[PDB]
Write a protein that binds this ligand. Structure first.
Ligand SMILES: Nc1ncnc2c1ncn2[C@@H]1O[C@H](COP(=O)(O)OP(=O)(O)OP(=O)(O)O)[C@@H](O)[C@H]1O
Ligand SMILES: Nc1ncnc2c1ncn2[C@@H]1O[C@H](COP(=O)(O)OP(=O)(O)OP(=O)(O)O)[C@@H](O)[C@H]1O
Ligand SMILES: Nc1ncnc2c1ncn2[C@@H]1O[C@H](COP(=O)(O)OP(=O)(O)OP(=O)(O)O)[C@@H](O)[C@H]1O
Lengths: 578, 136, 136, 136
């Protein structure tokens, strides 16, 4: 005999719509058994729960059992497997036999991909036999049902693709336990906080709002993180106290962590009373900063220290970018009220080294959003079915977590291989990419940025609206802009700043025919010439006559460097026309 | 037809064909054939390829015995012709396409299901069937 | 031109005839398998044949058709040849009318353009005032 | 002959040859040989090359045993000679070309089949054969 367990039903929240559906399907057959028997109509047999790990699949099942008050038969993935080749099958039979005999009951199959995976992926004669046993059992239930047998088979899996298509057909009802909403997260936070003494400054609503792609397990951890952060005060107190009881002078210290450890080791049997303190909103923010879960293994590239102050000029472009990306992320209220859908993607095109890569990062930084950079051919594999699968995976990861900027550097590699016939592998990848782009427009958060030094050979299909429609040109031909760039570069030095010198340098003819990369090089060249002057002068004086070093840079150094240096890019006609 | 040990499956296929040829007139019905005989290139198992071979051998045996007084017709049902091995496709001669279900057919199916239910007078199964395009 | 209402015109014709309509768009045809692509195309025509009158619509044909004038691969060659074969077959029996649409006409094989296949080349545009007000 | 584990395949080949040499007179028929013994350069698997080796070993064993009273002839059928490994080609001595059925050949085949039927006087098998292009 196996009676039900006592689990809290008030623990799970944020699953309003899904729980309602589950109720409808499970309540009628289990609770009103006499009614269903009289009518003669047939009901729901199998309920499959899917979604990521730690989503509360096992808990939901346990809760449902306890709440209804029916008999719970837990079937875990390795619980039925025996030693001899026959005991496993015998046990499966006994499980189903006892289950049909005693009613009402709930059979729960936790982690089903370990028992019934694809029969083509299993070359063993035992695994295929087990799948067959399950099928046979399912049929037996269906036949017995009109008498008074009431058993519902619940099941939980982490991946639907690994399951055998045959068992998928057998199971009729499916519930997706995915990613929660703002309201849902708020509820989860309250459930966890329930046993804690929160301060008045804590607003769970604010936490929930500023918590984008976090799951039930993640929120659980954020609460735990806060607990550890608060108890740092007690650690400091103990350290001071220990250094007074056992001084040990300066013999116990070589470093800081080691000395702390040693003091505690000496104490051992010393019991201390811990005061119950309340948590602040500041402690939660600190805890949040140190958390990185769920989509941590994705390959999340951290945002650099690049701001708008690092980019000289391009003020028009800055404003346009703010509208498109920062507009929807920071002000969702504004967009919903006016009536327009949020963006999908932009394309940065123009001459090399003009700040395209920088702009992408800068925008990501500003928005305080996530950033992923895939450059040129970082997709392709040696196998026949991995490149396409990988692309699919990227979009799946992006869909799961948002806000994020997906950056594709040098699209000049993948896109031109369409207009002229070359390969089959390249064809499959680009077609999958087009497919993935089309399959996303509603439920944004993921903004795709593309960059290319060559706008020439690219397929018009990719350019079409809904895919990468906003074509932003990054070029450089004006005087005012150059002065701003010079100031921006010479801003990051640390007396003598000299503004007048910067303007004059910009005015010169040689400077007119330059680019961002060229100006950077000029600055470096000037610095090198200055070093030569400092070295020659200092060595002569020290040897003949130790003095001080002068890092100052005058105009003579700039003038000499300017005379020598020549431009990189020659013809702008190629970029503009094509 | 699938068993536990690597040999019982093949033995059963033989027994099925043997009893079938012995007793006549009969109709052998192979329901869902893509699970037994899929493409031999897509099956990396040594048992699956062996089963396809057993079916082929059985087919030949029937052809030889036939002029005596053996009358057996092999019916088969599949959901997808692409998944079937081109070899077995060649063996089978007659093909019938049971396509898109009709208005009349849907009406009949609805009646079969409703049979145990107490329907009201305002319900017109004919109207339901008409406004039900691509449902199976 | 791109986005002139090709889909709308196609539906209007189909609706008026009170006939069936099937729409297969560009890359929503391609699979990972090799020998299944040709069998799938055969299946589409078989389904269309079974339920006639029907209009078979192919949106954005710029993908499949240009891979003839220049030697790319073997897979693309088989698919296009099967398509040409399927088109030639349907003409006397009829009931199934194939409509193709593309925003780009340049690189296309003249063989597909020949009368009896996709021979009737109709040029479409969008320059009307009344329509623009409705869109706004 | 192919099994599940890496060894059962080879064991079976041995058993086939062993039983065959023991019992005489017999005819061993290898149907579709390019699937078992293809070119060893085109097969990057360590199992396929090993199987070709097993066949070669078996062939030698027969030659040695022969002067006692062992009478076994190995027949084989293939669709393409170019796909076969040059090594096995050398082992095999006699070759028969079963070519394309011409107008004359088709006429003969028709007669073979009609043999048990009561044909009318208006039937000219010669006319049928003439107007039957690519039939096997
Ligand atoms: N939605 C949720 N609400 C509240 N608590 C949750 C939720 N999801 C998980 N938890 C906490 O995390 C624990 C793990 O839940 P559970 O084991 O049911 O997840 P799961 O999806 O079944 O994981 P797996 O399928 O990998 O076993 C629970 O004991 C619970 O305390
Ligand atoms: N406006 C700018 N401000 C600061 N640095 C710049 C600017 N433009 C170019 N650079 C310098 O050029 C380098 C490359 O910039 P970025 O990669 O963004 O240019 P790009 O247009 O992507 O061309 P490419 O990557 O092909 O060189 C950076 O390391 C940066 O120091
Ligand atoms: N996704 C859609 N599919 C079909 N019709 C649409 C769609 N969106 C809008 N419409 C209708 O068509 C008109 C807008 O025309 P639109 O510019 O979308 O060209 P279309 O040919 O209809 O769409 P598409 O170019 O995507 O095929 C509107 O009056 C609207 O009622």
């Amino acid at each position: 005999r196996t009676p039900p367990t006592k689990v809290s039903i008030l623990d799970i929240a944020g699953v309003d719509d899904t729980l309602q559906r589950l109720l409808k399907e499970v309540w009628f057959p289990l609770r009103g058994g006499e009614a269903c028997e009289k009518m003669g109509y047939r009901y729901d047999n199998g309920v499959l729960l899917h979604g990521p790990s730690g989503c509360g699949k096992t808990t939901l099942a346990h809760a449902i059992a306890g709440s209804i008050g029916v008999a719970f038969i837990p079937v875990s993935a390795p619980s039925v497997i025996g030693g001899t080749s026959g005991e496993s099958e015998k046990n499966i039979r006994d499980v189903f036999d006892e289950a049909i005999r005693l009613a009402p009951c709930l059979i729960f199959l936790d982690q089903i991909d370990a028992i019934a995976g694809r029969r083509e992926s299993a070359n063993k004669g035992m695994e295929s036999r087990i799948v067959a046993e399950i099928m046979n059992g399912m049929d037996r239930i269906r036949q017995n049902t009109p008498l008074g047998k009431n058993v519902v088979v619940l099941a939980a899996t982490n991946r639907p693709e690994f399951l055998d298509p045959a068992i998928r057909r057998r199971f009729s009802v499916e519930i997706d336990m995915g990613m929660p909403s703002e309201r849902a997260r708020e509820q989860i936070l309250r459930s966890l906080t329930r046993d804690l003494s929160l301060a008045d400054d804590i607003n769970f609503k604010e936490l929930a709002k500023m918590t984008p792609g976090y799951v039930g397990s993640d929120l659980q951890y954020v609460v735990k993180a806060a607990v550890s952060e608060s108890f740092q005060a007690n650690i400091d107190s103990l350290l001071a106290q220990a250094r007074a009881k056992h001084p040990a002078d300066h013999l116990a210290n070589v470093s800081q962590p080691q000395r702390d450890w040693l003091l505690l080791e000496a104490h051992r049997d010393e019991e201390v009373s811990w005061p119950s303190t309340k948590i602040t909103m500041e402690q939660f923010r600190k805890a949040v900063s140190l958390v990185q879960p769920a989509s941590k293994r994705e390959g999340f590239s951290t945002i650099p220290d690049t701001t708008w102050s690092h980019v000289g000029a391009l003020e028009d472009v800055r404003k346009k970018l703010e509208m498109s990306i920062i507009g929807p992320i920071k002000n969702p209220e504004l967009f919903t009220r006016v009536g327009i859908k949020p963006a999908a993607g932009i394309l940065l095109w123009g001459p090399p080294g003009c700040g395209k890569t920088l702009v992408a990062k800068a925008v990501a930084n500003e928005s305080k959003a996530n950033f992923i950079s895939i450059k040129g051919p970082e997709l392709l594999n040696k196998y026949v079915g991995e490149s396409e699968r990988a692309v699919r995976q990227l979009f799946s990861r992006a869909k799961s977590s948002a806000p994020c900027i997906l950056f594709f550097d040098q699209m000049d590699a993948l896109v031109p291989r369409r207009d002229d016939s070359l390969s089959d592998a390249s064809a499959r990848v680009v077609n999958t990419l087009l497919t993935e782009l089309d399959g996303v427009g509603d439920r944004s958060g993921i903004y795709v940025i593309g960059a290319t030094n060559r706008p020439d050979m690219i397929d018009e299909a990719i350019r079409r609206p809904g895919r990468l429609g906003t074509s932003i040109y990054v070029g450089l031909p004006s005087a005012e802009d150059r002065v701003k760039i010079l100031k921006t570069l010479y801003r990051n030095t640390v007396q003598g700043t000299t503004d007048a010198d910067l303007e004059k340098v910009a005015l010169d003819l040689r400077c007119t025919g330059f680019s961002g990369a060229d100006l950077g090089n000029l600055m470096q060249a000037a610095a090198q010439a200055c070093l030569e002057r400092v070295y020659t002068q200092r060595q002569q004086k020290r040897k003949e006559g130790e003095e001080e070093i002068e890092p100052v840079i005058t105009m003579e150094d700039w003038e000499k460097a300017l005379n020598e240096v020549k431009p990189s890019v020659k013809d702008p006609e190629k970029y503009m026309h094509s």
